[PDB]
Amino acid sequence: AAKNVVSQFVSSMSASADVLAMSKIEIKLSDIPEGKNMAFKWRGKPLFVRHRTKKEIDQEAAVEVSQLRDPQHDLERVKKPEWVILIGVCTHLGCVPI
Amino acid sequence: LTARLYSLLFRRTSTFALTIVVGALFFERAFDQGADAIYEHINEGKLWKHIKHKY
Amino acid sequence: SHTDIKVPDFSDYRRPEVLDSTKSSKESSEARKGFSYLITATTTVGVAY
Amino acid sequence: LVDPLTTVREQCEQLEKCVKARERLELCDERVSSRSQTEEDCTEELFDFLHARDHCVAHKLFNSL
Amino acid sequence: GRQFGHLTRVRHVITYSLSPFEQRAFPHYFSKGIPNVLRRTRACILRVAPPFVVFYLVYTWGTQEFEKSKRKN
Amino acid sequence: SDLELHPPSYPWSHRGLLSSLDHTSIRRGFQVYKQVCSSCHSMDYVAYRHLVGVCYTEDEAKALAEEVEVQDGPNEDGEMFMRPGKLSDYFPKPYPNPEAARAANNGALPPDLSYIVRARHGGEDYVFSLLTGYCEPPRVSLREGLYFNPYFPGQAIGMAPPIYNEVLEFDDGTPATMSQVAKDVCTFLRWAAEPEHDHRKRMGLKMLLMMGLLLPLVYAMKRHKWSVLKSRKLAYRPP
Amino acid sequence: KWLEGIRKWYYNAAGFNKLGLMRDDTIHENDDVKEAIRRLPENLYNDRVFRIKRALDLSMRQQILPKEQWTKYEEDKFYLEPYLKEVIRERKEREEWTKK
Amino acid sequence: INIRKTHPLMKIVNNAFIDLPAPSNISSWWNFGSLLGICLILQILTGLFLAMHYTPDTTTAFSSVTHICRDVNYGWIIRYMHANGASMFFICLFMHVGRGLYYGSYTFLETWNIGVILLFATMATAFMGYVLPWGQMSFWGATVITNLLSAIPYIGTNLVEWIWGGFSVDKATLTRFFAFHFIFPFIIAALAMVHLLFLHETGSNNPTGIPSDTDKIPFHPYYTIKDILGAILLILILMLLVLFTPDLLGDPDNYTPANPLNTPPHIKPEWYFLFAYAILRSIPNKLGGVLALVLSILVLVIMPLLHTSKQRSMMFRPISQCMFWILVADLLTLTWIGGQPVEHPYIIIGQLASIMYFLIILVMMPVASIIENNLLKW
Amino acid sequence: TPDTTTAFSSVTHICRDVNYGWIIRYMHANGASMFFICLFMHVGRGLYYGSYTF
Ligand code: HEC
Ligand code: HEM
Ligand code: HEM
Ligand code: FES
């Protein structure tokens, strides 16, 4: 009885039902000019869509990958090489990068 | 000067309580007079009472 | 031994009214007590206000 | 209209620090005109001139105003 | 730690205490207080301050090196 | 760039440790805010009852509130008509939505002027130098959609310089330079930031007279009751 | 050797010859030191509590003794150390008897 | 015989405030017990009035606080009393800890451990209260410290989506922190009573470290008027701080409303938590940073286990005295470095200040202690 | 959330949407009623068995 009361109180502090009512969206990329980022709210976090320069792609292909603590090529990060689509939050502790 | 003050207001206790109440009220009156006097003496000019007197 | 016990001299510390051995204490107590009680009364008035 | 602020700003840049800052901005102008089409574009000189000029403005303005 | 009475054991010790209404409030507060504060200051600044002048040097040197890093541009 | 510039130290009339604001200057700054700055920004938490006893009288407060009709509830029909608004209204928001605020400017949400004095590093001197120091870039062209003003992190504001030499010419003589309008709007923003600067300085003065009174005397009582232990003496008798 | 010069300068600048204390008036008291204090002759024990009461008095007034009554390093009558050594030896002997 | 020595309440009041034997030597540094008590009851009272005028929801929290500081009579002075009383509360708390560490009062064990638990409780309480005004700094402080709790593997992410009240800082986070900030100081008061109970069991200390069993004086009416004097000094400092420069310590960046999109450049705590944030961002490792912070306050737990000297105080040990003042200047250096941005000289001397902090405590105190034990022939 | 526009809606949100919040709400209310039941039993004991000589 004690562990079931504790389980019910911890589940009372877990979440809600209407907070679990968050799902997909569709986002448009037509408005953004060259080399700039646009943000969109989604699950309480920003949502980056950035248009980039082909020269930024070339420089990012020139920089090495094995020095990075998560080895990942730029073409692994994105489908179309300049229009990059990100969840705009730093994965350390939850900040939006400048 | 001091001997009459001790002979009156400091032998008994109830008289001491009575004089700290009466002194607190007199200090209230004179202290608020002095406080508003100094505060509207160092901000002469730019205060709402004179601007009200314009009207 | 207990007659050999002589209380030291606090002449640096006493109030100036009671410096000499000649002048009594009952004839000048009220000014000292009223001064200290005046300090306590002014403190009490400030705290209460 | 007779502006007081522009009067104070034109009369306060006589001081030596503001003069040296004026020539700093002019030599940076000579630099980016010289090394033309560059990516080093006269920041510190203009900020230092505004620093010195607006501090001497801060010293001696609100008497007039 | 307990109440009075059963703490220690003292043999013959004589304590004199004067009345507070008998003695002055401030006994020579500006002929001994100033040598006492200068003595207690001189016996502590050589153990307190030589870390704080190092902190003052660190503050000034860090300010100067941040201005060094940003004032070339 | 990220070379921030600290705004200078300006000798205000509320700079000292006991000085007060200038209520005539607050009134001029409010006339400025009504006729210039209220077309883009919002100052949500300044109602008209704050203006009754501070600068104006009560009659011109009713006049200024009945100049601008705001909004009201249903007239038992659900139609949301126009009420003149007696005194209890807040100031009329120009834009309903933040998206509506972005939908008439180059992005660039106009910040809300209730707390811009207390919200930015540097006080109202920052607002003075931001309103004042419009100048030109040496070499850096950015997009020609925004303007250049060096007292700004990012060094490119999206606000047009809204002053330009007698756009108001208000009640008394007092011709609208850049200086008069900027001084009045900085004073007014300091008032709208802290509504009780005057009463704060009043209680500060009463408190300094308090700690002139009590601090010799509580310390005198402490010295008196501790004057037994500060003069007790000792002697050691053995058998 | 100069390390004795360090010890003499340290006993000068350590601050417990200022208040009229000797070497063993400042010892921290755990159970062992409480036992070694209880194992004392009567005259040394009374002189000890008298010097301790003068030290607490002089630190209450924050006044430090004149030049002619500071305790000097040449006559350092440290006395509590033999009893404290005996307490430590009997305690360690009891500990070793428990360990084996 | 007497009213006081028979009545069950007045025996407690007698063994606390009247006939408690206190030493006749304690300086002004033994006033901060009563100053923390008076600050704690002042926080409870002024916060209770603020909680009477507050609506905890993410829509209307900032609006309600603005309603307090404009429309309610004297809500501005009660709010400023609460905030700057938190600041003076941590000033007197670090002076209390500095006393108890310098004068060798960490030879007490159970009082010291209940002390450290009180330090944990007051720091968590003041952080939740700093989340409560729902400004930009409060929003990002809640976000970053909750992800710091998510740093630990196998426990973290579930625990942090559990105390998030959702998946980010939603309404439920603001209401949870309102409730825990609004309950935890009563637990702090109960553990303060337990702290004081173990003290009155053992007995107090003095600036010499010699046990003062011969010269106890009663608490009343010497130290009562001494603590009244200390309280008047504290109230004048607190009130001059709230009536002349209320913004001299507070953050400018709080007063914007909570936009979850901006992330301002100069993110920082309120000034009392700078060194906790300076140990964190001066170690380029997530678990290493949060573990080094927890190990800092657990080093304060460790401190009774390294009393290998044979005096008690540091009054008579000048070498350890100089090393303690190096420790004080190093903690103030950590506070200053935490209150700055992050660049190359700041990175280097932040790393060096954290390293020198751990080197001073865990190594330099016993080395100074063993030179003391060698040097006086013991 | 104590706000007179959304206080009743907040209580309804507790009762409907939060996991087991209805059990906690009804436990609080009925525990208050059982609390006063036990309190009047306690006062009845204290009056009837003459414990009011303390
Ligand atoms: C519409 C054209 C505006 C008028 C008229 C005024 N302001 Fe403005 N202001 C406007 C915008 C679009 C912005 C945002 C720019 C940005 O990048 O933030 C602003 C900004 C401000 C600020 C804040 C700037 C900062 O330091 O971040 C302030 C203090 C400000 N504006 C004040 C202000 C005043 C006092 C005005 C009346 C004289 C005024 N603005 C007019 C748009 C417009
Ligand atoms: C919640 C905040 C705290 C309060 C209200 C508090 C309160 C007190 C009080 C009232 C005393 C008795 C008076 C005194 O000796 O100064 C005391 C003593 C003491 N406290 Fe705390 N304390 C707090 C936090 C701490 C902390 C964090 C520590 C460190 C771990 C600590 C360690 C001590 C010690 C060592 C003493 C004994 C000091 C002595 O006898 O000289 N306290 N505390
Ligand atoms: C149980 C007693 C307490 C109550 C009822 C209480 C209540 C409140 C309330 C209602 C607020 C919001 C008002 C505001 O933000 O200004 C608040 C904020 C705050 N509280 Fe408390 N509080 C209590 C104890 C404490 C304690 C013990 C501390 C730490 C010393 C503390 C520190 C703070 C801080 C720092 C803020 C933020 C102030 C600000 O930024 O304006 N509180 N408290
Ligand atoms: S670096 Fe710590 S959160 Fe981005």
Distances (CA, A) of F51 to F56, F59, F196, F226, H359: 6, 11, 12, 54, 60
Chain I neighbors of H171, CB-CB under 8 A: 1
CA angle (H204 as vertex; H199, H206 as ends), nearest 5:
155
* C-alpha span between F150 and H359 (Å, rounded): 45
* C-alpha span between G16 and A42 (Å, rounded): 69
* C-alpha span between H222 and H205 (Å, rounded): 17
Helices F197-225 and H223-243: crossing angle, nearest 10°?
Answer: 160
- Region of residue F130 (phi > 0: left; psi between -120 and 50: alpha; otherwise: beta): alpha
Considering H64, H87, H105, H227, which one is annotated as catalytic?
H227
Query: Dihedral angle at the C-alpha atoms of H68, H72, H73, H78, nearest 10 degrees?
Result: -20
Residue nearest to atom 8 of ligand 3 (CA): H47
* C-alpha span between G12 and E43 (Å, rounded): 13
**Exposed, middle or buried: residue H95 (CB in 10 Å: 0-12, 13-18, 19+)?**
middle
SS (H, E, C) chain F: CCCCCCCCCCCCCCCCCCCCCCHHHHHHHHHHHHHCHHHCCCCCCCEHHHHCCCCCCCHHHHHHHHHCCCCCCCCCCCCCCCCCCCCCCECCCCCCCHHHHHCCCCCCCCCCCCCHHHHCCCCHHHHHHHHHCCCCCCCCCCCCCCECCCCCCCCCECCCCCCCCCCCCCCCCCCCCHHHHHHHHHHHHHHHHCCCHHHHHHHHHHHHHHHHHHHHHHHHHHHHHCCCCCCCEEEECCC
Contact C14 E21 (CB under 8 A): no
Residue H354 is a catalytic residue: no
Pick the atom of ligand 4 nearest to H281's CA: 2
Contact G54 F230 (CB under 8 A): no
Q: Which amino acid is at F109?
A: L
Contact H21 E3 (CB under 8 A): yes
Candidate from H50, H57, H120 with most ligand 3 atoms within 8 A of CB, to mutate: H50
* C-alpha span between F193 and F187 (Å, rounded): 10
* C-alpha span between H179 and E10 (Å, rounded): 56
**Residue H285 half-sphere exposure, CB side, CA atoms within 13 Å?**
8
Q: Which two tokens stand for residue A67?
A: 């020095």
Indicate the number of domains in chain D.
1
Q: How far is CA D50 from the centre of its chain?
A: 5
A94 CA to centre of ligand 4 in angstroms:
6
Paired strand residues for C14: E23
* C-alpha span between B47 and D15 (Å, rounded): 38
Count A/I contacts: CB-CB distance under 8 Å: 22
Chain G neighbors of F229, CB-CB under 8 A: 60
Which of these, D5, D2, D1, lies nearest to D65 by C-alpha position?
A: D5
Element (H, E) at A49: strand A48-50
**Residue H255 half-sphere exposure, CB side, CA atoms within 13 Å?**
21
> How determined?
cryo-EM
* C-alpha span between A98 and A46 (Å, rounded): 13
Q: What b/e readout covers H25-58, taking b as 16+ CB neighbours within 10 angstroms?
A: bbeeebbbbbbbbbbbebbeebbebbeebbbbbb
Which of these, B53, B38, D57, lies nearest to F19 by C-alpha position?
A: B38
- Residues preceding gaps in chain A (C to N > 2.5 Å): none
Q: Which two tokens stand for residue H17?
A: 């405030």
**Exposed, middle or buried: residue D10 (CB in 10 Å: 0-12, 13-18, 19+)?**
exposed
CA angle (F235 as vertex; F232, F237 as ends), nearest 5:
150
Contact G61 F230 (CB under 8 A): yes
Instruction: Chain A: give the shortest CA distance to residue H171, in Å.
Output: 10
Count Cβ atoms below 10 Å from residue B45 Cβ, excluding itself.
10
Residues 6+ apart with CB under 8 A from A70: none
Pick the atom of ligand 4 nearest to A93's CA: 3
* C-alpha span between I51 and I54 (Å, rounded): 6
Q: How far is CA F162 from the centre of its chain?
A: 18
Considering H64, H87, H105, H204, which one is annotated as catalytic?
H204
Residue H19 is a catalytic residue: no
Phi, psi of A48 (to 5 degrees): -85, 135
Residue nearest to atom 13 of ligand 2 (CA): H33
Contact G46 E11 (CB under 8 A): yes
* C-alpha span between H108 and H119 (Å, rounded): 16
Residues 44 through 73 of chain E touching chain F, CB cutoff 8 Å: 70, 73
Q: What is the resolution of this structure in A?
A: 3.9
Ligand 4 is surrounded, with C-beta below 6 A, by: A 90, 92-93, 95
Q: Which two tokens stand for residue F227?
A: 């004057």
Chain I neighbors of H175, CB-CB under 8 A: 1
* C-alpha span between D51 and I10 (Å, rounded): 54
* C-alpha span between F114 and F130 (Å, rounded): 17
* C-alpha span between H104 and H315 (Å, rounded): 9
Candidate from F5, F6, F41 with most ligand 1 atoms within 8 A of CB, to mutate: F41
Chain H neighbors of F50, CB-CB under 8 A: 70
Phi, psi of I20 (to 5 degrees): 65, 10
Count Cβ atoms below 10 Å from residue H363 Cβ, excluding itself.
11
Count Cβ atoms below 10 Å from residue D51 Cβ, excluding itself.
17
Count Cβ atoms below 10 Å from residue F133 Cβ, excluding itself.
20
Paired strand residues for H257: H135
Helical segments of G1-100, H only: 2-13, 31-38, 42-61, 81-99
Q: Residue I4: closest CA among chain H residues belongs to which residue?
A: H55
- Region of residue F169 (phi > 0: left; psi between -120 and 50: alpha; otherwise: beta): left
Count Cβ atoms below 10 Å from residue B42 Cβ, excluding itself.
13
H28 touches chain A (CB under 8 A): no
Residues 6+ apart with CB under 8 A from F5: D47, D50, D51, F150, F151
* C-alpha span between H167 and H165 (Å, rounded): 7
* C-alpha span between F230 and F215 (Å, rounded): 20
Instruction: Chain H: give the shortest CA distance to residue E62, in Å.
Output: 7
Chain F neighbors of D47, CB-CB under 8 A: 3, 5, 150
Q: Which amino acid is at B24?
A: A
Q: Residue C46: closest CA among chain F residues belongs to which residue?
A: F214
A96 CA to centre of ligand 4 in angstroms:
9
Residues 6+ apart with CB under 8 A from A77: A84
- Sheet containing strand A37-39, edge to edge, reads A37-39, A48-50, A84-86
Asked whether the beta carbons of A49 and A85 are under 8 A apart, the reply is yes
Asked whether the beta carbons of F55 and F30 are under 8 A apart, the reply is yes
Asked whether the beta carbons of H18 and H219 are under 8 A apart, the reply is yes
Count Cβ atoms below 10 Å from residue H373 Cβ, excluding itself.
15
Paired strand residues for E23: C14
* C-alpha span between D44 and D41 (Å, rounded): 9
Asked whether the beta carbons of H162 and A14 are under 8 A apart, the reply is yes
* C-alpha span between H217 and E7 (Å, rounded): 13
CATH number for the domain that contains residue D36: 1.10.287.20
Query: Dihedral angle at the C-alpha atoms of H1, H3, H6, H7, nearest 10 degrees?
Result: 160
Strands of chain H, DSSP E: 21-23, 216-218
Cis ω for the linkage preceding A71 (within 30 of 0): no
* C-alpha span between H183 and H190 (Å, rounded): 12
Domain that includes residue D12, residue range: 1-65
Binding-site members of I for heme b are 28, 42
* C-alpha span between H45 and G77 (Å, rounded): 58
Phi, psi of A85 (to 5 degrees): -120, 115
Q: Closest to E13 (Cβ–Cβ): which among G42, G50, G62? A: G50
DSSP string, C1-49: --SS------TTTB-GGG-SSSS-STTSHHHHHHHHHHHHHHHHHHHH-
H262 touches chain F (CB under 8 A): no
Residue nearest to atom 1 of ligand 4 (CA): A92
CA angle (G62 as vertex; G56, G64 as ends), nearest 5:
85
3-class state of residue H138 by DSSP: helix
Instruction: For ligand 2, say whether the CB of H108 is within 6 Å of any of its atoms.
Output: yes
Asked whether the beta carbons of H282 and H288 are under 8 A apart, the reply is no
Asked whether the beta carbons of H140 and H317 are under 8 A apart, the reply is no
Residue H200 is a catalytic residue: yes
* C-alpha span between I21 and I1 (Å, rounded): 14
* C-alpha span between E51 and E62 (Å, rounded): 16
